[PDB]
């Protein structure tokens, strides 16, 4: 993963004619890769955040002008290759388009390609705490008035958790304290903003860290204590000592020259308090390692061993009856990292024979199929090059009209549509499904060959036209689990409704996992949920179901999980199952209560220390901590007390939240959410239990669709270590240091001889 | 039915090498595709051995013989080892020049004072065979690679009459806390002691002896109340490296109770077996001992056939 470098044509700034459905602006990106700012029509800049851009389209995929007043003034075809459309939004339902049309040639494509690399970067989304405080500083330096000065009301609205303390904070640094004045950006260098976030947010929790790790001598931290800070507290105690080695005194001196500012203390190899408060937000002290985020998972296993991201009734924007369908929800889902979309196709009008997509007899608006198949063809492989599974639902009872939707899949998708099977894996009984690396760029259709479900229980038998495209993933009518095993065809799949897979969950969960080791299984919510409420997908991920389909419209607690656990593995939409849910020689019960023979357990212990900059008004804030894993791990749900009324530096004197028996830690996932009094959401962050570090780290909270927030952050102290059973925890202390134990063992036998 | 066999032993002792021989003898061997999947790890063990030998020169204060070769030292010193995919021309020209230096060969002779692998001479002597563009790793090149194990991996092997579940664990001091979750239903404990550890110190603690910890881990394992009906099969790995190490460095310096003569690889082979067997408080339970060599496929096939009849007779 590369750091977000800006190509120099995005820093000097080209000229676009920004238009909305004629003013000339010059778009620039700041040299860190943070914002996209342009001198607006009122001589005041308007910064669109780069880390909240969904997509940047150009060419014929951009939005065309429809006003005749705006079409003639732009110059209307060579003018289709200059249009740039930046679509951004906090959720995939509500997106804010930003249309541009360039004036120079061959510059709209160097922009909208490089603008998408910065807006889909992994080291900018998972960046450190000190990177995000610099992002709020760039927001102040860019947004200026007509005169080119920072107004003091611009600094006041940012830290709106206090007013009197802010105005005397700028007065102490010799700046302009009055509200209606304006600071020049020459005298607001980042050195001053460091002193402004120190003379305003006084933190007593770092001083309990400095007094703990051995600084009884008050001013500075000695170099020999700082190696003993990182090698004991910050180092994950489950790792190896040869793979990830501990630090060296020559190695932990590059930190002092990087973070400690005071040169009269830098020459003596000592780190001060201001040097230690910077190091915790440094790039080295992150809550997640570098290897947990990149595309590092083994992609050679069969397709039946991967949690595939999925979506149920993707074309809708709202509830299943009142809403309006849109083609834009296919683009905003597949860019997110969704891989299984749905299409409910119906029979067209009698004079204009063209199939459309709608919902069945629920007065929902109808979008044409040929516009939807252009949407999945355009943005399938823009964020991840892995196979997309088009879950059709054929209601077309015309054998003539099926040739139109058969030719549309071959003409629009073209080379990427997997028509014939792969040469290594034939369509024979006993051979497994291919690997996701084997179909990097192949779109698989899913159709038939030759009360609580609603439309999905009544669909017509497909004819010879649509059956040639169905090769690997083929839906079959479900019979049982004995007949699914004695048939031994590992390519067929069967899609369950939510209430039918839940009675199949408790009747036989030991046979449900062994069905998913060979074949796929789609799970979609029932027809009673007419308000687009999403079930908890961890009920069906404990039995290894792959295509657990969720409504991508409504972002409740369920969708906050489904967008949180797939941000890892490089936003690819394919997580590998744990090693005991895909091996045909082992088998385990998902409803266990003891530690599994062969699976290393874990013992997580999270404790919330404090918080910073959490909200914009004087409210109380509490923090919820859950864990979504096996049903033996999920039993504990903790919550802090509320603060006194601070939303600025609230401190929580809390006992640690003990998660003592994490049975399957390569499946479970923590969730640290911070709310307000009355239950208003602020931020959440989902961390896996496998790769969460230890020690006093930072957590930068995300909003509901998992986009990073600039200012709010928590500060937690975790102890993720291996689980030792209580019956013999002293026969695991003799393994760790057997030299000392064998000298003590005969000593207890020698002294008994006297 | 099946049996669960544990492969226990300390760090860098040769536990996964015993598994790879089972994949070659009694399983699906390394084909032409699986050998080619190992060619990036052979390059990484050449650079890991050399970069640990370059940084061993200043802490031991050994100057280089040729000054022309010294200019190659800073080139290899800055190779990021994890991001090595190819073995290109200035990388082979520097290390092949660096291996023939008489000051490096004095640092390799004093390799007991730092941490270096046991296959660091097998690679930087066939460097003409490993650098060529049509490089396919032979089956002896795969058995000499070094990929350090972390966790618990269970390998099942079919022997046409019974199935052995060979459990591969780690060996380091942070990895012996994970051995608890594989102690349930253990048939046999195959303890793997390297015989060429009697002068090197531990990688996790640079002061304590390596042989005195494997001697202390064997005392802890067979004196558990848990392993009361499990047949412990003591393997003594690395029988080839004892024949090179005993000819210049002795056993008497690191063990004062060695009455035997010097430069005797057969008499010292009994004394380490005398050192390990004598740590048994109960004489009714016996320990089946086997000297072995984990990269000699005949010397695994001869030994494991004597182990397979030993397990099946007692069970
Ligand atoms: N010369 C020689 N080397 C051996 C022998 N057995 C093991 N080794 C080497 O010991 C090294 C480390 O063994 P390894 O499998 O990594 O043990 P592990 O770390 O516990 O998994 C490997 O590189 C092998 O090449 C042997 O009999 N002779
Ligand atoms: F015991 Al190891 F890598 F040192 F498996
Ligand atoms: Ca449907
Ligand atoms: Mg191993």
PDB file of C-alpha atoms in Angstrom, chain A residues 235 237-243 579-580 583 585-586 595-601 721-725 727-728 730-732 734-739 741-742 745, chain B residues 4 146 148-156 165 172-185 203-204 208-209 212-213 216-217 219-221 224 226:
ATOM      1  CA  UNK A 235       3.864  -5.307  21.592  1.00  0.00           C
ATOM      2  CA  UNK A 237       2.033 -10.936  23.102  1.00  0.00           C
ATOM      3  CA  UNK A 238       0.674 -13.552  20.671  1.00  0.00           C
ATOM      4  CA  UNK A 239       3.313 -12.968  17.994  1.00  0.00           C
ATOM      5  CA  UNK A 240       6.574 -14.831  17.466  1.00  0.00           C
ATOM      6  CA  UNK A 241      10.014 -13.655  18.557  1.00  0.00           C
ATOM      7  CA  UNK A 242      11.767 -14.560  15.285  1.00  0.00           C
ATOM      8  CA  UNK A 243       9.195 -13.264  12.788  1.00  0.00           C
ATOM      9  CA  UNK A 579      -9.414 -23.026   8.951  1.00  0.00           C
ATOM     10  CA  UNK A 580     -11.866 -25.381  10.686  1.00  0.00           C
ATOM     11  CA  UNK A 583     -11.211 -28.415   5.928  1.00  0.00           C
ATOM     12  CA  UNK A 585     -11.134 -33.707   7.677  1.00  0.00           C
ATOM     13  CA  UNK A 586     -12.026 -31.563  10.712  1.00  0.00           C
ATOM     14  CA  UNK A 595     -12.407 -24.253  23.787  1.00  0.00           C
ATOM     15  CA  UNK A 596     -12.120 -26.276  20.595  1.00  0.00           C
ATOM     16  CA  UNK A 597      -9.447 -28.969  20.281  1.00  0.00           C
ATOM     17  CA  UNK A 598      -6.950 -27.431  17.860  1.00  0.00           C
ATOM     18  CA  UNK A 599      -8.261 -23.853  17.777  1.00  0.00           C
ATOM     19  CA  UNK A 600      -6.209 -21.347  19.761  1.00  0.00           C
ATOM     20  CA  UNK A 601      -8.524 -19.280  21.942  1.00  0.00           C
ATOM     21  CA  UNK A 721      -3.227 -12.503  24.857  1.00  0.00           C
ATOM     22  CA  UNK A 722      -3.586 -16.261  24.557  1.00  0.00           C
ATOM     23  CA  UNK A 723      -6.121 -18.093  26.696  1.00  0.00           C
ATOM     24  CA  UNK A 724      -4.789 -20.471  29.359  1.00  0.00           C
ATOM     25  CA  UNK A 725      -7.362 -22.718  31.096  1.00  0.00           C
ATOM     26  CA  UNK A 727      -7.188 -25.894  35.712  1.00  0.00           C
ATOM     27  CA  UNK A 728      -3.574 -25.815  34.467  1.00  0.00           C
ATOM     28  CA  UNK A 730       0.829 -23.214  36.185  1.00  0.00           C
ATOM     29  CA  UNK A 731       1.841 -25.997  33.801  1.00  0.00           C
ATOM     30  CA  UNK A 732       1.963 -23.338  31.101  1.00  0.00           C
ATOM     31  CA  UNK A 734       6.845 -24.031  33.176  1.00  0.00           C
ATOM     32  CA  UNK A 735       6.827 -24.252  29.386  1.00  0.00           C
ATOM     33  CA  UNK A 736       7.534 -20.546  28.827  1.00  0.00           C
ATOM     34  CA  UNK A 737      10.666 -20.512  31.022  1.00  0.00           C
ATOM     35  CA  UNK A 738      11.754 -24.126  31.588  1.00  0.00           C
ATOM     36  CA  UNK A 739      15.302 -23.202  32.652  1.00  0.00           C
ATOM     37  CA  UNK A 741      11.463 -24.162  36.447  1.00  0.00           C
ATOM     38  CA  UNK A 742      13.863 -27.106  36.358  1.00  0.00           C
ATOM     39  CA  UNK A 745      11.668 -28.415  40.651  1.00  0.00           C
TER      40      UNK A 745
ATOM     41  CA  UNK B   4      -2.863 -37.929  17.284  1.00  0.00           C
ATOM     42  CA  UNK B 146      13.604 -21.992   6.727  1.00  0.00           C
ATOM     43  CA  UNK B 148       9.421 -20.254  11.011  1.00  0.00           C
ATOM     44  CA  UNK B 149       6.259 -21.846  12.350  1.00  0.00           C
ATOM     45  CA  UNK B 150       3.629 -20.043  14.424  1.00  0.00           C
ATOM     46  CA  UNK B 151       0.509 -21.690  15.796  1.00  0.00           C
ATOM     47  CA  UNK B 152      -0.925 -25.187  15.672  1.00  0.00           C
ATOM     48  CA  UNK B 153      -1.227 -26.978  12.333  1.00  0.00           C
ATOM     49  CA  UNK B 154      -2.588 -30.521  12.159  1.00  0.00           C
ATOM     50  CA  UNK B 155      -1.392 -32.752   9.337  1.00  0.00           C
ATOM     51  CA  UNK B 156      -3.205 -36.059   8.683  1.00  0.00           C
ATOM     52  CA  UNK B 165      -2.546 -36.860  12.880  1.00  0.00           C
ATOM     53  CA  UNK B 172       9.901 -20.340  20.736  1.00  0.00           C
ATOM     54  CA  UNK B 173       9.291 -19.070  24.270  1.00  0.00           C
ATOM     55  CA  UNK B 174       6.219 -17.121  23.170  1.00  0.00           C
ATOM     56  CA  UNK B 175       4.894 -20.172  21.316  1.00  0.00           C
ATOM     57  CA  UNK B 176       4.838 -22.605  24.220  1.00  0.00           C
ATOM     58  CA  UNK B 177       1.737 -20.937  25.631  1.00  0.00           C
ATOM     59  CA  UNK B 178      -0.149 -22.213  22.575  1.00  0.00           C
ATOM     60  CA  UNK B 179       0.811 -25.863  23.157  1.00  0.00           C
ATOM     61  CA  UNK B 180      -2.047 -26.244  25.662  1.00  0.00           C
ATOM     62  CA  UNK B 181      -4.785 -26.445  23.019  1.00  0.00           C
ATOM     63  CA  UNK B 182      -3.276 -29.596  21.467  1.00  0.00           C
ATOM     64  CA  UNK B 183      -2.582 -31.603  24.648  1.00  0.00           C
ATOM     65  CA  UNK B 184      -6.000 -33.297  24.600  1.00  0.00           C
ATOM     66  CA  UNK B 185      -6.025 -36.909  23.298  1.00  0.00           C
ATOM     67  CA  UNK B 203      17.638 -16.536  19.811  1.00  0.00           C
ATOM     68  CA  UNK B 204      15.029 -15.466  22.388  1.00  0.00           C
ATOM     69  CA  UNK B 208      21.277 -19.389  28.109  1.00  0.00           C
ATOM     70  CA  UNK B 209      22.470 -22.552  26.405  1.00  0.00           C
ATOM     71  CA  UNK B 212      20.284 -27.032  28.486  1.00  0.00           C
ATOM     72  CA  UNK B 213      16.786 -25.839  27.556  1.00  0.00           C
ATOM     73  CA  UNK B 216      14.931 -28.809  30.552  1.00  0.00           C
ATOM     74  CA  UNK B 217      11.915 -28.977  28.249  1.00  0.00           C
ATOM     75  CA  UNK B 219      12.178 -32.840  31.951  1.00  0.00           C
ATOM     76  CA  UNK B 220       9.011 -30.737  32.068  1.00  0.00           C
ATOM     77  CA  UNK B 221       7.098 -32.661  29.396  1.00  0.00           C
ATOM     78  CA  UNK B 224       3.395 -33.922  33.639  1.00  0.00           C
ATOM     79  CA  UNK B 226      -1.215 -35.475  31.885  1.00  0.00           C
TER      80      UNK B 226
END
